[model samples]
Target: ANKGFLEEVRKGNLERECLEEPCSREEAFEALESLSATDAFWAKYTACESARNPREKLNECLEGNCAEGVGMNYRGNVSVTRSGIECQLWRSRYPHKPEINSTTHPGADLRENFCRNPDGSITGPWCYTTSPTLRREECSVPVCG
Candidate 1:
């Protein structure tokens, strides 16, 4: 009946266990179609969902541009054009850019490398270093870490 409870149903548990769980987008469509859920809750979910479409917006942002203000998404090593919604998830997760200059922070160099290019467009995920020392110091395993 409350917003908090409804959000759980709409987005699922925000925990490690629920991280691997698959929730259907169609379920949201059906819920709204059924009209069983209150407008307030639906409105909240809709607002959140609308904000999640940064990929399309990002494509537009990167159109004839580099990754200056667009931010980095460390899903996997790929060009900006190739990244889809999954990459967008990281942008939402880390609103603030990770400190790239740090020598020991996870994904510091990776995120930095992903955002910088001389041709005005990124190449791929080459920021991921294979060196054991750099990999341990930079990349965030399982997720661009």
Candidate 2:
């Protein structure tokens, strides 16, 4: 099957909640503020990468891969193609780290999420980092370098 088809799945998952709802800028900003501060959202990401003893040194790769932005990953959309997923970095602070790129193009199986579909669905890698200021840490993952 065309791998890109999966984009549809991931997008679908996100659609249920990723699509824009009727709201004002104030409401949107408030939502964004809270989601950014939500530790559970970021913490769960740690758990995802830790899913398998840092498979393929993913821990090292993702260690400093967080993106920093004024917006929460809310409605953050991505497009998966033959080349890999293209994550749209919005108001991001960490735009140059390979780890950040890896989120959209992990070495092998450590693919990240590309939430939001045209019709609205979230199907790609469920694990995605939104902290634009992706942290800084030494790279221990052999595949990363």
Candidate 3:
């Protein structure tokens, strides 16, 4: 099932197509784990996972949405925004926010966003922000410093 999905993605179809026989989460992760770390296969897999949601992950098949730069940005906590913010600054807004570590070095901060593909795989906590320019609106608000 996964092999078929990979083929579709290679054909440039990154839509959330339904899998005829969806793999289990364990199976999906295993499919990811089995691939060589440096290839289109892995890139598409990781990117798609990063762009989808958990419920979506549990029941849909996805492609390289993130790799293709598709998906939405968000404001503080959980507001979706179209203005294109920087992920770093949004992360910086919260005091003492934990860092997202490399896959080789897991961190203590668990504040990740998530999206899942059908056939049950993982995707994100994609650290996206809605604006590159620091919104003066945020800065103008008086804080009791």
Candidate 4:
């Protein structure tokens, strides 16, 4: 009789697979509650596998405010934002910042147009306020793929 208090459940493989897949906010809640007491206890209380609100914590993580900083606050065809967690190129007036392609050892797609210059390159007053995604460049001009 030493099987322990939480050792009498057979969690089907399909259930485990579903959990591995990404679920919507509502689905996640329902799934968590459908499990038995033992499964719920172990799954919900596991400190090592913590879950967080993805959308809310996106800025913090992508920048330096969250656990995983994967968000690119300064990458785009124009200024994504001038201030906040992912602010960049304050003097450039919100231009597409190029990133280095580590695999090729250079900017992913560097173009003269995309490159921010002190002359008169950034004269237009346009802003690309869309979802932020890191761009790969090659050091020619400021362009996004």
Model 4 TM-score, all chains together:
0.16
Given candidate 3, what's the lDDT at residue 11?
28
Q: 47-140, model 1: which lDDT tens digit per residue?
A: 2332233545433322322222222332334423232212222222243232333333222223333322211123322232322233211222
Give each model's whole-structure lDDT: 0.29, 0.29, 0.30, 0.28
**Model 2, range 1-145, lDDT digits (tens) per residue?**
1134343343222112222222233333344456443232243233233232334443332342322121112222232322343343322434433333424422222223343211112222222333344322111111222
Off by over 4 Å in 3: 1-18, 29-61, 64-84, 89-145
Better of 1 and 4 by lDDT: 1
Candidate 1 ranges beyond 4 A from true positions: 1-12, 15-50, 53-69, 78-99, 102-145
User: What order do you get sorting by lDDT, best first?
Assistant: 3, 1, 2, 4
lDDT comparing candidate 2 with the true structure: 0.29
Pairwise lDDT winner, candidates 2 and 3: 3
- Superposition error at 47 for model 4 (Å): 16
lDDT of 4 by residue, 1-145 (tens): 1133542253333233233433333333444565343333232222112332442343232222211211111123433333222323323223444233222322111222232221112331122222255322222222211
User: lDDT score, residue 72, model 3?
Assistant: 18
Native-structure RMSD, model 3: 12.8
Model 3 poorest 10 in a row by lDDT = 136-145
TM-score of each: 0.19, 0.19, 0.24, 0.16
